Amino acid sequence: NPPPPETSNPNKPKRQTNQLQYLLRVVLKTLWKHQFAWPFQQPVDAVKLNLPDYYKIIKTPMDMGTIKKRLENNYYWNAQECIQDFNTMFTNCYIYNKPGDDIVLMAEALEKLFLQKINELPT
């Protein structure tokens, strides 16, 4: 396994915005507690789950645990950085797996919910 993505940098500028608060308090919260969330709550442990090629295929890993930490630590300046990380998580699943796979259908359901919440992103 690689080390997890960076989640904290004290030398980055910090700002609180309505969009970033919403992403943490509404979007991430809602996806976290979704019935199909558990495979996406932490980095893929390719050693433990016997997926030796996962990090040969996925060079930009992302998970909701990392996203939570990034939001909490004010790692993102722009809301789009956070939205991009969610999208990377979904696309990684689509990349590593095949169309119509069970995990892909779970990711598709989370993505659908994500887009419903993003629709209500504050201005």
Binding site for ligand FZE (CB under 6 A): 38-40, 44, 49, 51, 93, 96-97, 102-103
For ligand FZE, the closer of residues 15 and 59 by Cβ is 59
Instruction: In whole angstroms, give the CA distance from residue 107 to residue 99.
Output: 11
Nearer to ligand FZE, 77 or 96 (CB): 96
CB of residue 91 vs ligand FZE: minimum separation in angstroms? 10
Amino acid at site 72: E
Give least dist CB 113 to ligand FZE, A: 16
**Taking Cα atoms as reference points, which of 57, 68, 61 lies closest to residue 95?**
57
Q: Smallest Cα–Cα separation from 63: which of 7, 119, 11?
A: 7
